[PDB]
Amino acid sequence: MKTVITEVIASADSQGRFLNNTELQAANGRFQRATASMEAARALTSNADSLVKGAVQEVYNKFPYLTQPGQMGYGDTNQAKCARDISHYLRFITYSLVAGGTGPLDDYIVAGLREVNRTFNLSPSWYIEALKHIKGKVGSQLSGQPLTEANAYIDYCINALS
Amino acid sequence: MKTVITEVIASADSQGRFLNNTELQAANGRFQRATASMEAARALTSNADSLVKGAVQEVYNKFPYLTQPGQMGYGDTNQAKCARDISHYLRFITYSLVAGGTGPLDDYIVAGLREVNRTFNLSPSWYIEALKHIKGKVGSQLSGQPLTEANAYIDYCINALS
Amino acid sequence: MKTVITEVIASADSQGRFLNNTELQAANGRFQRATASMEAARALTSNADSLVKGAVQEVYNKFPYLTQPGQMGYGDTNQAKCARDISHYLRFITYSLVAGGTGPLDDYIVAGLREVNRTFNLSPSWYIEALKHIKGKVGSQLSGQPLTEANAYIDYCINALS
Amino acid sequence: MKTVITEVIASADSQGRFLNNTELQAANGRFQRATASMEAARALTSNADSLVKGAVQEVYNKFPYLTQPGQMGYGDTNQAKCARDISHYLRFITYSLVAGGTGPLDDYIVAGLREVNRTFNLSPSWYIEALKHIKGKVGSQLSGQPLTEANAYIDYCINALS
Amino acid sequence: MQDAFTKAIVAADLRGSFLSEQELNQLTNLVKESNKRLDAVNAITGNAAEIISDAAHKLFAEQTDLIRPGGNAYPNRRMAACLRDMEIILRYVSYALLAGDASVLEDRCLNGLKETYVALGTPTRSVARAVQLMKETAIGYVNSPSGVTRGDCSALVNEAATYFDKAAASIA
Amino acid sequence: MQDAFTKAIVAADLRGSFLSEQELNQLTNLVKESNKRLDAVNAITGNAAEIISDAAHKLFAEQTDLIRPGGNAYPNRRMAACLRDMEIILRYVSYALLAGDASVLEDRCLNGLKETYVALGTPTRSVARAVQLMKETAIGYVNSPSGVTRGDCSALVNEAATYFDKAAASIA
Amino acid sequence: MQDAFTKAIVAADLRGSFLSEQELNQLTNLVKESNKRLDAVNAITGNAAEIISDAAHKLFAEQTDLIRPGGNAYPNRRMAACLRDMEIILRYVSYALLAGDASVLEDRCLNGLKETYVALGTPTRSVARAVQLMKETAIGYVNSPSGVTRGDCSALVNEAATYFDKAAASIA
Amino acid sequence: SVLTGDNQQRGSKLFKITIALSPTLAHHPWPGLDTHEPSQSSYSTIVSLERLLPEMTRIKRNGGRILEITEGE
Amino acid sequence: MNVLTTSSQRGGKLFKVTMTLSPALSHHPWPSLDTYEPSQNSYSVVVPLDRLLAEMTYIKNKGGRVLDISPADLEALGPPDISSVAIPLKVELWAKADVSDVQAAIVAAYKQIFGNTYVLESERLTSAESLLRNGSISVREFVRLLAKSELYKERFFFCTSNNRFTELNFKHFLGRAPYNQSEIAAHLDRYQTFGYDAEIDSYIDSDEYIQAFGENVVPYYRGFKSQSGQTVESFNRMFKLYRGDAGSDTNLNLQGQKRRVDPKNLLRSGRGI
Numbered sequence A, B, C, D: 001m002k003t004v005i006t007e008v009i010a011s012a013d014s015q016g017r018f019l020n021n022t023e024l025q026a027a028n029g030r031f032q033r034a035t036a037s038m039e040a041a042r043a044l045t046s047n048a049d050s051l052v053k054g055a056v057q058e059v060y061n062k063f064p065y066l067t068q069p070g071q072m073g074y075g076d077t078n079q080a081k082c083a084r085d086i087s088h089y090l091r092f093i094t095y096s097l098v099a100g101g102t103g104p105l106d107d108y109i110v111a112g113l114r115e116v117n118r119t120f121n122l123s124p125s126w127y128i129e130a131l132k133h134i135k136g137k138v139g140s141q142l143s144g145q146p147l148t149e150a151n152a153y154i155d156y157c158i159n160a161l162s
Numbered sequence E, F, G: 001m002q003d004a005f006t007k008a009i010v011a012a013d014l015r016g017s018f019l020s021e022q023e024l025n026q027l028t029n030l031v032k033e034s035n036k037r038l039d040a041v042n043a044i045t046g047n048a049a050e051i052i053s054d055a056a057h058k059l060f061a062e063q064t065d066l067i068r069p070g071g072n073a074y075p076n077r078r079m080a081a082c083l084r085d086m087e088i089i090l091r092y093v094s095y096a097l098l099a100g101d102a103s104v105l106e107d108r109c110l111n112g113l114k115e116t117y118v119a120l121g122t123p124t125r126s127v128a129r130a131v132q133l134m135k136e137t138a139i140g141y142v143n144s145p146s147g148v149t150r151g152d153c154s155a156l157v158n159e160a161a162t163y164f165d166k167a168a169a170s171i172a
Numbered sequence H: 001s002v003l004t005g006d007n008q009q010r011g012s013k014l015f016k017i018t019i020a021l022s023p024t025l026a027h028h029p030w031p032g033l034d035t036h037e038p039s040q041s042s043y044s045t046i047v048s049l050e051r052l053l054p055e056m057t058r059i060k061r062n063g064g065r066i067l068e069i070t071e072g073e
Numbered sequence I: 001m002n003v004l005t006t007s008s009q010r011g012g013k014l015f016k017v018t019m020t021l022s023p024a025l026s027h028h029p030w031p032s033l034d035t036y037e038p039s040q041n042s043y044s045v046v047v048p049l050d051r052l053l054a055e056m057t058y059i060k061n062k063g064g065r066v067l068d069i070s071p072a073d074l075e076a077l078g079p080p081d082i083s084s085v086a087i088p089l090k091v092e093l094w095a096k097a098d099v100s101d102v103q104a105a106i107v108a109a110y111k112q113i114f115g116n117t118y119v120l121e122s123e124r125l126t127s128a129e130s131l132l133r134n135g136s137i138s139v140r141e142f143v144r145l146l147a148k149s150e151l152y153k154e155r156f157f158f159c160t161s162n163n164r165f166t167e168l169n170f171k172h173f174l175g176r177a178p179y180n181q182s183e184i185a186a187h188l189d190r191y192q193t194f195g196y197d198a199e200i201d202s203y204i205d206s207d208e209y210i211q212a213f214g215e216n217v218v219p220y221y222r223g224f225k226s227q228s229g230q231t232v233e234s235f236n237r238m239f240k241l242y243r244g245d246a247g248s249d250t251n252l253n254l255q256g257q258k259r260r261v262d263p264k265n266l267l268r269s270g271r272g273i
């Protein structure tokens, strides 16, 4: 799993050398940032649910036809799944904030994203809206660096999805 | 040349991916530290000379026989060289403080150190004393993080020499 | 380009051996089949246009919202593209029938399919319908082996798209 | 272990070929030489001790300060070690004469020489003197080819040490 | 490799000298801008996908023939390459932007690129065009973000430009 | 790989849940110690060469036979290896110390080590001994540094110990 | 590799004899079926994507836990593998079907698979289940095509089954 | 081959794989028909999960079959 | 082209200059728009040092542009001797290899894997070497480790282009040079999605690697002798990729990392993509 700390270890390890000043400087960076990161996570974790409702909802407004019978958005099972999924995205994001790296995101969400989505005919677009809608809401509860961090990670997914 | 910034680029580049939040965190670390580092360099740069005199000198006290005729410490040419050399070590150290990485040290001083020293019969020991003596003096002009940084780099060489 | 003939040559060539009976048998297969294949191509080539119209159309019935303003199906440029694209699929299929291999399809259409589609947000689904609708029409103008051949190739794409 | 005999076998073996005239010629060379080599070994083996005493001693004359307290040459343990070590060098040399190759030397003495010496701060210089002093003494007890052989091996170490 | 700091070092080294006080003050101030610098990079990386997507659309609207049978972006396989390339160039540019130095970009990405295009028959001019199209879009984001403390980024913006342009030029 | 943070995550993941507030507070405080943590590491790395050198001397004073013909540390070639190994183990330990987690140490370094030693005929006992000798020397530095703000490092010191000990045990 | 023809040969070889007239008549008959045989294969390959897609849906509707955190099909990465595997097995089965021989399937694909699955903690039962789900869907197509000359494919259908089953068994 | 430490630098779960060796997989650089080594007719290697699929497929196409798979730890 | 004399009758170091010709620089004595002879799109002249400045200014003041300048002495030098690479030599690492044999392999591996390029004591990898010689790692696996190592990346992959890195790779991992534009294209795409490790993996994993020096044989130079499925031109490309003994792949030299094999030459052997 890719976090700042793991990477410097890895790099040190490859060359076969002790952790010298170079790497510690880097580590220090991760730790200083953490305070902001951690704050952001507390904020998302608390409002989770509400964010999720809002998102799922949005998607339907954006793509009305999904809710029509014979479509994917239709019938509760699907809605349940849709909810579940977004929850996940969120969950991971929090994780990544705390871990101080994209690692958690990469391994859970991103790796294999495409093929899963292809085989089950999930349109990336949907997810994206979810995220965007979220991003917008988060853009109220947070501010300054905490905010900035939240965005970074949220986006990271947008880019991976697209 | 290995600095924090170059490394993360390198790592990013190898994997073939954009610089994401992970790396920037690291970079940030380097920049925050710099203020201390830079301070230390200004301090060494100013007292350079005095540090050098003191060191060279020390070495002779530590190894009297060097100054006897037919030895290495003997005759001005050699003394001049001895001075020059230590100056270099210092010079590089400053560089490394500012560059925020061991890079400068590695490429100038360390790589090939052994063989040079072997072929010309320079005893690592000597250099080491020089450094130690220095470290001791620096341990007055500096304080707090600035100091800490200075040490790190000075040591890094001790270890490479030994 | 992968056709029966090219492959056996390739295989022969790798091993470093002359074309022996093994390969010729295979070649013979390709040539016997051709008569049916060729027939199929003449049939598609003639009705091309009509097939295309029908398909494009279908897609819109299947996905009404595409034709609404602010969507992809909307505004002539896009419609033109949509047409163009399907034409291509067809064109290639004919080619492949005649060449007696998937080769033409693979190299023009399939290779890079995913990424193109991702970057421009073309939904595979659409294409698929087009094809299916086609397949259904073709299932009238043709019969017996000629038909069978036509299908094979058409499908091959469906699978590649999905 | 590298001796003439082992090498030709090795080379023959690699190619997968019987020992032909080429190699035997080489072998013949060795074994012809042996008579001289063997003689040399008998001479060193006998005077061993005396050579060792003389050497150790020499080193101290050459580097008086070693015998001062707080140095390496000081206190019996160290002297004992110093003796032991030189014995070894000698021992191996004899071996190599008899084996008719550097093999024995390479594997015992030379491989890892540097790092050992670095980590324990043994100065190559010392050993060298030991050897030189030896070489000088040997230059009396022996003569002609026997001598020549003795030198070769002794030197081989000098070069490895330096 | 190289970057702003390392570079200044190297210069100093050949003179054989400790760093000039003047020279330190370059680096001192360079540090101060860091935060700005970072955000700039962050903006590109965050929007990457889009930047490209966008540029492409515009590239193909202009040079219709690229996407016509017999053109260089046809068929799919080729198109894919063209997209891939754009991305790469961008990726590097970003790297440079962080380093505060063209080098990385010049050595890894640009050097020898032009020749490849010509031998393949890929039209260098069009490539260059794409690079610019990218440039403009990218700056767009760098310069208009949300939730950042408002201030002056110009200095960075221009340096960004230059990188893009070195690219455009050497390819072209 | 793993480290303190990542680990907690993973646990949380299997439960399928957001991180408990309680759990955050572990990490929150872990951060606060960082500075201490870092200095600890810095101390080891700074003294590395010495730590080893020292330990070795003591190891060989005790087990004279290792350095006698027929022993395991003789001749030079072997000796060299033995030194190298010690160092490696140390290197890893440090890594762990920074991560705040044994894993890295266990997985890259300790895993299979015993068996190797066995196959070679290296006496595992002695190896373990060396590791301890190292431990004590290392702590020595961690705990007595220069220019560091005075305060309590115990917590870190003990964790350090544990790492050394996991090593000793699994080798032995 | 091996297949129906080659196999019979090999047997004959060890006896040291020309092929039995009886044995020829196996092969003679086998030829006659070819056309049927081919269409069967064609049907699978044509529907491949679907077969899988379908089976998967059903697999996950049944064993909900596989897709829950802590299950084996979670997270994405794993899911992907699981899909990929199913497909592979299918691919091989088809191969066999053409050859007229299990071998290829057994040797390249099935051999060692159980143990792998075990080591990973993949639940072999579920894998087997999937294979069957696939089987039924596949037969579905083989057995109900359009524009093929109507006749009896049973013989082939059963052989198909067997292949699927060998798979199911050896995995399970 | 017993792993002395995690062979691979890049990290994932590692699995020891024991294979019966075809002459092709490890041909000796010898004139005539190449012979795999007598001492090991059953090479055992340590592999990362990611590499595990490629390694097995390459083993498969070459004569030799997987004797056993064991998790490397 | 070949230059026949190193120096002018009056002492003077000749220098071969290569330009792209322009209609102004040379034109047919024909009616209608002036055309340079097509065959001389890239013209070459050998000029003494004295006239070099004037010659070059004139070329550039017309639409000419200078492709490259090179001393005549380096030019008009023998094509490198293939003596050492005609028969590579080959190293096998037996099981139960004694201390020396393991050393030889290691050296040989560093030689082939890194080019002549020198590896310093600090650069050298103890860990990887450690593993070899107590078993556990194949020669093949060591080779993978070296190409993974930063040392490798810093020289070959981080300085030059991915285009250059591919053929650089081909030569080190396989004696062969690259055949065809396709190989170069495939590797580039692999690198973009899978990344650096997967690309490195794909040469060692490839069957061509397995078929020759598959396991426990240090890679040797297959190119310079006739190989199956190898385009004839590849053999010529091997002379461009491999310049003499005591010629290396060096980031260090001025503009260190460039392409030995021109893109056009690759296109000749095969096109399609």
Ligand SMILES: *[C@H](C)[C@H]1/C(=C/c2[nH]c(/C=C3N=C(/C=C4\NC(=O)C(CC)=C4C)C(C)=C\3CCC(=O)O)c(CCC(=O)O)c2C)NC(=O)[C@@H]1C
Binding pocket: A059, A066, A072, A073, A074, A078, A079, A081, A082, A083, A085, A088, A089, A108, A109, A116, A120, A122, A126, A127, A130, G057, G060, G067, G074, G075, G076, G079
């Ligand atoms: C929401 C925007 C839309 C929606 C979603 C939806 N998803 C599925 C099925 C799956 N979705 C996922 C996604 C994940 N599962 C994971 O484990 C992870 C990583 C943590 C992700 C991102 C997966 C794997 C599936 C496949 C099977 C499964 O869910 O177990 C469906 C069902 C489609 C089907 O064919 O079964 C739906 C509908 N639901 C909506 O209403 C929106 C349109």
Ligand SMILES: *[C@H](C)[C@H]1/C(=C/c2[nH]c(/C=C3N=C(/C=C4\NC(=O)C(CC)=C4C)C(C)=C\3CCC(=O)O)c(CCC(=O)O)c2C)NC(=O)[C@@H]1C
Binding pocket: B059, B066, B072, B073, B074, B077, B078, B079, B081, B082, B083, B085, B088, B108, B109, B116, B120, B122, B126, B127
């Ligand atoms: C000082 C502790 C002792 C001393 C030094 C001394 N040095 C040399 C010769 C060399 N010194 C170096 C060192 C460096 N040169 C470099 O380029 C670098 C990196 C920037 C270093 C660290 C070198 C390379 C040489 C060899 C070549 C040269 O002449 O420069 C000597 C002369 C020995 C000789 O035979 O050349 C001496 C004496 N002088 C003393 O008296 C101290 C004991």
Ligand SMILES: *[C@H](C)[C@H]1/C(=C/c2[nH]c(/C=C3N=C(/C=C4\NC(=O)C(CC)=C4C)C(C)=C\3CCC(=O)O)c(CCC(=O)O)c2C)NC(=O)[C@@H]1C
Binding pocket: C059, C066, C072, C073, C074, C077, C078, C079, C081, C082, C083, C085, C088, C108, C109, C116, C120, C122, C126, C127, C130, E057, E060, E067, E074, E075, E076, E079
């Ligand atoms: C029809 C089902 C829908 C539709 C299609 C549409 N396509 C594009 C753009 C492209 N489509 C392709 C497809 C091909 N072009 C090729 O050369 C090949 C291989 C031979 C294929 C399969 C490509 C490559 C493009 C991208 C380049 C381009 O500009 O054409 C668009 C325009 C996308 C845009 O963002 O402008 C559209 C709309 N149009 C419809 O009405 C349907 C929804």
Ligand SMILES: *[C@H](C)[C@H]1/C(=C/c2[nH]c(/C=C3N=C(/C=C4\NC(=O)C(CC)=C4C)C(C)=C\3CCC(=O)O)c(CCC(=O)O)c2C)NC(=O)[C@@H]1C
Binding pocket: D059, D066, D072, D073, D074, D078, D079, D081, D082, D083, D085, D088, D108, D109, D116, D120, D122, D126, D127, D130, F057, F060, F067, F074, F075, F076, F079
């Ligand atoms: C004699 C000129 C000086 C001296 C020697 C001395 N040696 C050591 C320690 C070691 N010496 C060796 C050398 C060898 N041991 C071997 O097995 C071989 C190869 C066969 C050699 C050449 C080694 C390995 C050591 C390390 C520990 C050990 O003694 O085994 C010392 C002790 C230094 C210390 O503090 O460790 C000394 C003093 N003694 C003198 O009086 C001269 C200066």
Ligand SMILES: *[C@H](C)[C@H]1/C(=C/c2[nH]c(/C=C3N=C(/C=C4\NC(=O)C(CC)=C4C)C(C)=C\3CCC(=O)O)c(CCC(=O)O)c2C)NC(=O)[C@@H]1C
Binding pocket: E066, E072, E073, E078, E079, E081, E082, E083, E085, E086, E088, E089, E108, E109, E110, E113, E116, E120, E122, E123, E126, E127, E130, I161, I162, I163, I184, I185, I186, I188, I189, I273
């Ligand atoms: C898109 C903006 C334009 C375009 C691009 C294009 N490129 C290729 C093929 C290749 N491009 C490269 C270039 C690179 N190699 C590197 O290492 C780097 C970074 C330093 C780059 C950017 C290479 C090597 C190839 C050949 C191999 C491959 O295709 O992967 C094509 C395909 C053409 C062909 O015949 O291969 C295209 C289309 N051309 C356009 O049409 C756009 C204007």
Ligand SMILES: *[C@H](C)[C@H]1/C(=C/c2[nH]c(/C=C3N=C(/C=C4\NC(=O)C(CC)=C4C)C(C)=C\3CCC(=O)O)c(CCC(=O)O)c2C)NC(=O)[C@@H]1C
Binding pocket: A033, A144, A145, A148, B024, B025, B028, E032, E033, E035, E036, E038, E039, E040, E042, E142, E143, E144, E145, E146, E148, E149, E150, E151, E152, E153, E156
């Ligand atoms: C320039 C294109 C835009 C802009 C930038 C801007 N940023 C700041 C200040 C900060 N921005 C950051 C961002 C980071 N610092 C880090 O360590 C990282 C990596 C994790 C990032 C992304 C931070 C922390 C600061 C300091 C606090 C803050 O956000 O204000 C400023 C303020 C002035 C200055 O830094 O000197 C500015 C101006 N503003 C613009 O006009 C553009 C929108």
Ligand SMILES: *[C@H](C)[C@H]1/C(=C/c2[nH]c(/C=C3N=C(/C=C4\NC(=O)C(CC)=C4C)C(C)=C\3CCC(=O)O)c(CCC(=O)O)c2C)NC(=O)[C@@H]1C
Binding pocket: F066, F072, F073, F074, F078, F079, F081, F082, F083, F084, F085, F086, F088, F089, F108, F109, F110, F113, F116, F120, F122, F123, F126, F127, F130, H004, H005, H006, I129, I130, I131, I132, I133, I134
């Ligand atoms: C020193 C305290 C003791 C000692 C060490 C010693 N080790 C070897 C040989 C090896 N030791 C290792 C060590 C590692 N393998 C790994 O995977 C790791 C962790 C990642 C390590 C640290 C290995 C690989 C070997 C074998 C090959 C090698 O070159 O080291 C020896 C030499 C054994 C021989 O007979 O050649 C020795 C001596 N032995 C002692 O005497 C001390 C008690």
Ligand SMILES: *[C@H](C)[C@H]1/C(=C/c2[nH]c(/C=C3N=C(/C=C4\NC(=O)C(CC)=C4C)C(C)=C\3CCC(=O)O)c(CCC(=O)O)c2C)NC(=O)[C@@H]1C
Binding pocket: A021, A024, A025, A028, B033, B144, B145, B148, F032, F033, F035, F036, F038, F039, F040, F042, F142, F143, F144, F145, F148, F149, F150, F151, F152, F153, F156
């Ligand atoms: C513990 C073994 C000993 C000890 C440690 C100690 N350190 C601090 C505080 C700091 N230590 C550092 C060091 C670094 N931070 C970095 O980013 C880097 C890498 C470049 C290093 C090396 C820093 C910056 C701090 C903060 C400022 C300061 O130095 O005080 C403390 C103070 C308490 C705290 O947690 O901050 C302590 C106690 N002190 C001892 O007495 C132990 C022997």
Ligand SMILES: *[C@H](C)[C@H]1/C(=C/c2[nH]c(/C=C3N=C(/C=C4\NC(=O)C(CC)=C4C)C(C)=C\3CCC(=O)O)c(CCC(=O)O)c2C)NC(=O)[C@@H]1C
Binding pocket: G066, G072, G073, G078, G079, G081, G082, G083, G085, G086, G088, G089, G108, G109, G113, G116, G120, G122, G123, G126, G127, G130, H049, H050, H052, H053, H056, H057
């Ligand atoms: C899906 C129906 C079920 C399932 C599959 C699943 N497999 C893995 C991982 C692997 N599965 C294989 C299988 C193969 N390797 C081969 O060589 C072949 C064909 C020759 C097969 C069939 C292998 C080797 C792996 C491990 C390495 C790899 O993925 O390439 C997983 C993930 C296991 C993990 O922890 O990574 C899964 C999920 N398991 C289920 O949950 C389904 C019931």
Ligand SMILES: *[C@H](C)[C@H]1/C(=C/c2[nH]c(/C=C3N=C(/C=C4\NC(=O)C(CC)=C4C)C(C)=C\3CCC(=O)O)c(CCC(=O)O)c2C)NC(=O)[C@@H]1C
Binding pocket: C033, C144, C145, C148, G032, G033, G035, G036, G038, G039, G040, G042, G142, G143, G144, G145, G148, G149, G150, G151, G152, G153, G156
């Ligand atoms: C069996 C599952 C179903 C079925 C099969 C069936 N097929 C035929 C006859 C033929 N089918 C083919 C197919 C091919 N021959 C080829 O060379 C290729 C590859 C290019 C294919 C796809 C052919 C050529 C024939 C012969 C002519 C014809 O189809 O009319 C039969 C007829 C009996 C026979 O053995 O010829 C049958 C029964 N039909 C069903 O309804 C089954 C469910």
Ligand SMILES: *[C@H](C)[C@H]1/C(=C/c2[nH]c(/C=C3N=C(/C=C4\NC(=O)C(CC)=C4C)C(C)=C\3CCC(=O)O)c(CCC(=O)O)c2C)NC(=O)[C@@H]1C
Binding pocket: I023, I034, I035, I036, I037, I038
């Ligand atoms: C016309 C059908 C196509 C076309 C032609 C074209 N050619 C040029 C430029 C040159 N063409 C030549 C050709 C020759 N020079 C020779 O001496 C001979 C016979 C011995 C030939 C056939 C040359 C050498 C040039 C370049 C220098 C010159 O002008 O003589 C151009 C103009 C290129 C420019 O940018 O200058 C063109 C347009 N190109 C087309 O557009 C048509 C498809």
Ligand SMILES: *[C@H](C)[C@H]1/C(=C/c2[nH]c(/C=C3N=C(/C=C4\NC(=O)C(CC)=C4C)C(C)=C\3CCC(=O)O)c(CCC(=O)O)c2C)NC(=O)[C@@H]1C
Binding pocket: I116, I117, I118, I245, I246, I247, I248, I250, I252, I253
């Ligand atoms: C010393 C007398 C002068 C000098 C030498 C110098 N050489 C290099 C670099 C290399 N030189 C070689 C040499 C050889 N390669 C071979 O294989 C052989 C014969 C088999 C030889 C003699 C090579 C391969 C290199 C390149 C690889 C590398 O540099 O690592 C340098 C370093 C160049 C640099 O800028 O780093 C130097 C300094 N230069 C002097 O100053 C002396 C006049």
